[PDB]
Amino acid sequence: GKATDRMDAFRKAKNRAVHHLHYIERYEDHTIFHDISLRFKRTHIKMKKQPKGYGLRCHRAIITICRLIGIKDMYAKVSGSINMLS
Amino acid sequence: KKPTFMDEEVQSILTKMTGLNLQKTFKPAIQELKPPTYKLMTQAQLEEATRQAVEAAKVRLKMPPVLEERVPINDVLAEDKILEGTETTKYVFTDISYSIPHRERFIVVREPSGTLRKASWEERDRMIQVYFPKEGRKILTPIIFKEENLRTMYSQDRHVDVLNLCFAQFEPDSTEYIKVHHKTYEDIDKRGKYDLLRSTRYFGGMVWYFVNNKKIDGLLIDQIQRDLIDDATNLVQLYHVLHPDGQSAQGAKDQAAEGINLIKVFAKTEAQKGAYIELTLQTYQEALSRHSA
Amino acid sequence: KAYRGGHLTIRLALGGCTNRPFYRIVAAHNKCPRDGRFVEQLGSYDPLPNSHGEKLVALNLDRIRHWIGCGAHLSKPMEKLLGLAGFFPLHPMMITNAERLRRKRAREVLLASQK
Amino acid sequence: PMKGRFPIRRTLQYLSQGNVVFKDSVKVMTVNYNTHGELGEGARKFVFFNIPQIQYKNPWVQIMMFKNMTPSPFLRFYLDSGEQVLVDVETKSNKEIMEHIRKILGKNEETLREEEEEKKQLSHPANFGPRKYCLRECICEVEGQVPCPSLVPLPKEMRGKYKAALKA
Amino acid sequence: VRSSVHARWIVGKVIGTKMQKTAKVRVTRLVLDPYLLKYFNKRKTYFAHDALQQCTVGDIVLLRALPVPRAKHVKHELAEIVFKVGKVIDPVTGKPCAGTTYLESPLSS
RNA sequence: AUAGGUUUGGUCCUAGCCUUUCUAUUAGCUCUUAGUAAGAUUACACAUGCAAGCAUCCCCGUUCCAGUGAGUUCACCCUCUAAAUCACCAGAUCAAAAGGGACAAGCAUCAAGCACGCAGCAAUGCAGCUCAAAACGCUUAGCCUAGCCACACCCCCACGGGAAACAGCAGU
Ligand code: FES
Ligand SMILES: [Mg+2]
Ligand SMILES: [Mg+2]
Ligand SMILES: [Mg+2]
Ligand SMILES: [Mg+2]
Ligand SMILES: [Mg+2]
Ligand SMILES: [Mg+2]
Numbered sequence: 001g002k003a004t005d006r007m008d009a010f011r012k013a014k015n016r017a018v019h020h021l022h023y024i025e026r027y028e029d030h031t032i033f034h035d036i037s038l039r040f041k042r043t044h045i046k047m048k049k050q051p052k053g054y055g056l057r058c059h060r061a062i063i064t065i066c067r068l069i070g071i072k073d074m075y076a077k078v079s080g081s082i083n084m085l086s
Numbered sequence: 087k088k089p090t091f092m093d094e095e096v097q098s099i100l101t102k103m104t105g106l107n108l109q110k111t112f113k114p115a116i117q118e119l120k121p122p123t124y125k126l127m128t129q130a131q132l133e134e135a136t137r138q139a140v141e142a143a144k145v146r147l148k149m150p151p152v153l154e155e156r157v158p159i160n161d162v163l164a165e166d167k168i169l170e171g172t173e174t175t176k177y178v179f180t181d182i183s184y185s186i187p188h189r190e191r192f193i194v195v196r197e198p199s200g201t202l203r204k205a206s207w208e209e210r211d212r213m214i215q216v217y218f219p220k221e222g223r224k225i226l227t228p229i230i231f232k233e234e235n236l237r238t239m240y241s242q243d244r245h246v247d248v249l250n251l252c253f254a255q256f257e258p259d260s261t262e263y264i265k266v267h268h269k270t271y272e273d274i275d276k277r278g279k280y281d282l283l284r285s286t287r288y289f290g291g292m293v294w295y296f297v298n299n300k301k302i303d304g305l306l307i308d309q310i311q312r313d314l315i316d317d318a319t320n321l322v323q324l325y326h327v328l329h330p331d332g333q334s335a336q337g338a339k340d341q342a343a344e345g346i347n348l349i350k351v352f353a354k355t356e357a358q359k360g361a362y363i364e365l366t367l368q369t370y371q372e373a374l375s376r377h378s379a
Numbered sequence: 380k381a382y383r384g385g386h387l388t389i390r391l392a393l394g395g396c397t398n399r400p401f402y403r404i405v406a407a408h409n410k411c412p413r414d415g416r417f418v419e420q421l422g423s424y425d426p427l428p429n430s431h432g433e434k435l436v437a438l439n440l441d442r443i444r445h446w447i448g449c450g451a452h453l454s455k456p457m458e459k460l461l462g463l464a465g466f467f468p469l470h471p472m473m474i475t476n477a478e479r480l481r482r483k484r485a486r487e488v489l490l491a492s493q494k
Numbered sequence: 495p496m497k498g499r500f501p502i503r504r505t506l507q508y509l510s511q512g513n514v515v516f517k518d519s520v521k522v523m524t525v526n527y528n529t530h531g532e533l534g535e536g537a538r539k540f541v542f543f544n545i546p547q548i549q550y551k552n553p554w555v556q557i558m559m560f561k562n563m564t565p566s567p568f569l570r571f572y573l574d575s576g577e578q579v580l581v582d583v584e585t586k587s588n589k590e591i592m593e594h595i596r597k598i599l600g601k602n603e604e605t606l607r608e609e610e611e612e613k614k615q616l617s618h619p620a621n622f623g624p625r626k627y628c629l630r631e632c633i634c635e636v637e638g639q640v641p642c643p644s645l646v647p648l649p650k651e652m653r654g655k656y657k658a659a660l661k662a
Numbered sequence: 663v664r665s666s667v668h669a670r671w672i673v674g675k676v677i678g679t680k681m682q683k684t685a686k687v688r689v690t691r692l693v694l695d696p697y698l699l700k701y702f703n704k705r706k707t708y709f710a711h712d713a714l715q716q717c718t719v720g721d722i723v724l725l726r727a728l729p730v731p732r733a734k735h736v737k738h739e740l741a742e743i744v745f746k747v748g749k750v751i752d753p754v755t756g757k758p759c760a761g762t763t764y765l766e767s768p769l770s771s
Numbered sequence: 772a773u774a775g776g777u778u779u780g781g782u783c784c785u786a787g788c789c790u791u792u793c794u795a796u797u798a799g800c801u802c803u804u805a806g807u808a809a810g811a812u813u814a815c816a817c818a819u820g821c822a823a824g825c826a827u828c829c830c831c832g833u834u835c836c837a838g839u840g841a842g843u844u845c846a847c848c849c850u851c852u853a854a855a856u857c858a859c860c861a862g863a864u865c866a867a868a869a870g871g872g873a874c875a876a877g878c879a880u881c882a883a884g885c886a887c888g889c890a891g892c893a894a895u896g897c898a899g900c901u902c903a904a905a906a907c908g909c910u911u912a913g914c915c916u917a918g919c920c921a922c923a924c925c926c927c928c929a930c931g932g933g934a935a936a937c938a939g940c941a942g943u
C-alpha cells in the first residue's frame with residue numbers, strides 16, 4: 001500500500017489484497033503437507049510440517065500469515081535477507 | 087482333570103473371542119508426537135503392511151497369564167535371641183545380584199526382636215521396585231486403587247485403563263492384582279460393558295473369570311445382541327469344557343448340541359437369565375430370517 | 380595415583396547430605412579416599428528408617444563373594460551388616476554390645492524399682 | 495545443503511546402518527578396484543557407499559584401496575592368524591559384496607547381541623552415583639525414604655544441631 | 663603372538679630403501695573427520711626389516727609385528743610383497759598384469 | 772534463534788556492531804525467617820594453636836587422608852612384569868617400572884631440525900632420520916571430572932646448595 005496518509009495506505013492495501021487471494025492447502029486443516037525448502041530472491045525459508053499441538057514456531061510475520069491462512073502447527077526458519085516483503 | 091488357562095484350545099477360543107479390531111488395538115496414543123512419515127505403497131505392499139500390523143496386534147494382545155493367589159511367606163531363617171532390643175527398626179536386606187530372577191531373589195528382614203525372616207510378598211515387591219525400578223510401577227500403592235477412585239474410573243468407563251494400571255503396579259498373583267481384576271470384571275458384568283475389553287488382552291481373562299464363576303449369562307447375551315454367534319458358541323463350549331459335570335453339559339452331550347443348540351441348551355439349563363437369553367436368541371433368529379430369503 | 384602397598388576393602392562410602400547419612404557399599408582400594416574412586420559398588424545402606432520403619436540394605440551378594448574370593452577385606456560396619464543379614468556369623472562385638480546393653484538395662488531397671 | 499554427491503553418506507545415522515562387524519581375527523582389508531569397466535561397477539559403488547560403514551563399525555581394521563592395479567576388482571582380508579581371504583567381487587553388486595563379506599567374516603547377530611548383553615551388564619540399576627553412570631544420585635530420590643534435607647527440612651529431632659541441645 | 667607392538671598386521675607402500683636391510687613403508691588408514699564425518703587417509707611411516715633387501719620403492723608390502731623392536735623404529739618385518747612394483751600378478755587369475763591389462767591371457771591355461 | 776535495532780534523500784544485497792536468553796564473579800542500592808549446597812584473587816610471606824599414633828618393648832604408620840593448579844600431551848588401550856591382598860600356598864585381584872599405539876589451543880611473520888637412522892655378535896660399515904598431511908620452535912592451559920595428572924618453598928631432580936618453607940584445618 002502506497003499513500004501519503006497511513007489510513008489511506010491501510011485501506012488501499014487491505015482492499016487490493018482480497019483480489020489477490022491464494023488458497024493454501026493444509027494437511028488435516030492444521031499444517032502444511034510436507035517440508036518446504038525455498039529461496040525467494042535472497043531469503044531462504046525452511047518450513048517443517050509438525051503434528052497437532054506443536055504450535056507455530058516461526059518468524060513472527062510467518063506466525064501472523066499462518067494464523068491468517070488457518071495453519072496451527074508448523075516450524076519455520078528464515079535465513080539470509082529477512083526483508084519482510086521478500 | 088480340568089483345562090488350564092494356557093491350554094492351546096483355551097488360547098484359541100479366547101483369542102477368537104477377543105476379536106482383532108486393529109483400530110482399537112492401535113488407537114492413537116495421547117503421547118509426545120513426532121511428525122508422521124509417509125510411504126508410497128502398491129495394493130500388495132499395503133496388504134503386506136496391514137498383515138504386519140496384524141501380527142504386531144496379536145503380539146500386543148498376547149494375554150497375561152492367570153495365576154492363583156500367592157501364598158503368604160512366614161519362613162524364619164534364624165532366631166538370634168541375643169539381638170532382642172539391640173535396635174528398634176527392621177533391616178531389609180535385598181540380594182541385588184543382576185542375573186537372579188526377581189522371584190528367586192533373597193529379600194530377608196532382621197526384625198527388632200532378632201528374628202531373621204524372609205520378606206513378605208508386599209515387601210518383596212516393594213524392595214524389587216526400589217532397587218530395580220520398573221516402568222509404570224510406584225513404590226507406595228497408588229490411591230487410584232481405592233474403591234471410590236475405582237468407581238470413578240468405572241463411571242468414566244476406563245476399565246481398560248484401570249486394568250493397565252493394575253497390571254503395571256501389581257504382580258499377576260498379587261492379592262491387590264486379583265482383587266482389582268475381579269472388581270473390574272464385576273463392574274463390567276453389572277453394567278454390561280463387555281465391548282470395552284474386546285480387541286484387548288484382558289478380554290480373555292474376563293471371559294475366563296466369568297466361566298470359572300459360572301456367570302456367562304450377560305456375556306452371552308451381549309454376544310448374541312452383537313450377532314457374534316460363533317463367539318457365543320465357543321463360549322458355551324468352553325463353559326461346558328470347564329464344567330463337564332454341569333447339567334447344561336450333560337444336556338448338550340445327550341442332545342445334538344452342535345451350534346445354536348448349545349446356546350439353547352445353556353439357556354434352558356444353568357442359565358440364571360435363561361428366559362432373557364432365549365428372548366435375545368429369538369430376536370437374533372428374527373434378524374437372520376429378515377435376510378435369509 | 381601409584382599407591383604404594385594397600386589392598387581392597389569392602390566398605391561403606393558415605394554420601395547423602397547433612398543430617399541424612401546414606402551409604403554405598405564399595406569394593407574400594409583401602410588407601411583411596413572414603414568417597415573417592417572404587418573398584419565396584421556392591422550395594423547400598425539407608426541408615427534412616429523409611430515410612431515403613433525399615434533400614435533398606437542392598438547387597439550384591441554374588442559380587443561380594445567374588446571380591447572376598449579375590450581377597451578384599453571387610454570394614455567392621457560391613458561385617459556387622461553382613462552378620463545382621465545372616466550372610467556372616469553375628470559379629471563378636473555385636474553380641475558383646477547386646478550383652479552390655481542388657482546389663483545396663485538391668486542396672487537401670489534395678490534403680491527404677493528401688494524407688 | 496551439505497556438499498558432495500550423496501551427502502547422506504556423511505551422517506552418523508547412515509554410518510551406523512553398516513551391518514558388517516568383522517571377527518576379531520580380521521585386521522586388514524585391501525580393496526582393489528577399477529575406476530572404469532561395467533564389470534567393476536559393483537566394486538566402485540561398494541567403495542563409494544559401504545566402505546565408510548565398514549570402517550565406522552570396525553575402527554581398528556586397516557582398510558586400504560587400490561585403483562586400476564589389476565584387471566578385475568577384488569577384496570583381500572588379512573587376518574590375525576596370517577590367513578589371507580581373497581574375495582572376487584566382479585559382477586557382484588555392492589549389496590551382494592556386503593552380504594558376502596558379512597557371511598564369511600562378519601559377526602553374527604547373536605554374537606553382537608551377546609556383546610550388547612555384556613555391555614548392559616555394567617549399568618546395574620541398583621547402583622547409586624552421578625547421573626552419568628547411575629540412574630539415581632541418592633536413596634532420597636526413592637519415594638518413601640527420608641527425603642533430601644535440601645528440599646524437605648528434617649525434624650529438629652533428627653537434625654544434629656538440636657541433638658546437640660538435647661545432649662546439653 | 664605375544665608381541666608388544668600395537669599393530670599386529672599392517673599393509674602399506676614402500677617409499678624408501680636407503681637403509682640397510684630396512685624398507686620404509688607408508689601405511690594409510692581411513693580416519694573419520696569428526697566435523698565433516700568424511701573419511702580421509704592418514705599416513706604413517708613404518709620401518710620394516712627386510713633380510714632379502716628385495717623390497718623396491720613403490721612396492722605394496724605386508725608387515726608383521728616383530729616380537730619386540732629390533733631397533734629404535736624397526737618394529738615390523740616384511741612378510742609378503744603383495745604387489746611388486748610393475749610386476750603385479752592378478753591374485754584372482756594368477757596371470758601377470760599391467761594395470762587393467764592381462765600380460766598373459768587367463769585363457770592361456 | 773521464531774528473531775530485532777542500526778549504513779541511505781530512498782530501496783535491495785553484503786557485512787560489522789549491538790538488543791532480547793542463561794549462567795558465574797565483582798560493585799552500587801536494598802534485605803525478614805528456616806533447610807540444603809558452595810566459598811582467599813595469588814605456587815607471595817607467615818605469629819599462634821592443632822593436624823600421627825598404636826602397642827607388652829620388635830614391627831607396623833606417619834608414602835595414606837587432606838591441599839594447590841605452578842608446571843604439563845607421565846592420565847587411556849595392549850604387551851611384559853615388579854610391589855601389595857587372598858592366614859603359608861594359589862594362580863586370582865590390584866598395579867608400578869619398561870615397550871608399542873593414542874592423547875590440548877593459538878602462531879608457518881616458528882620452515883627447516885642438525886645427527887635428530889639403519890646393519891652387525893662385536894669389530895665396524897652404510898648416510899641416513901623428522902618435516903608444509905606442519906618436524907624444530909614460541910606463547911597459552913591443569914584434564915578427557917564416580918574422578919584423573921602434576922607439585923609439595925626454589926635450584927625439573929635434591930647428594931648438595933639457597934634457606935628455614937600452612938598449596939593440612941582455623942587464622943594473618
Ligand atoms: S541427594 Fe539424597 S540426601 Fe541429598
Ligand atoms: Mg550483590
Ligand atoms: Mg598454569
Ligand atoms: Mg612480524
Ligand atoms: Mg621440588
Ligand atoms: Mg607458602
Ligand atoms: Mg590454610
Ligand SMILES: [Mg+2]
Pocket residue numbers: none
Ligand atoms: Mg588479610
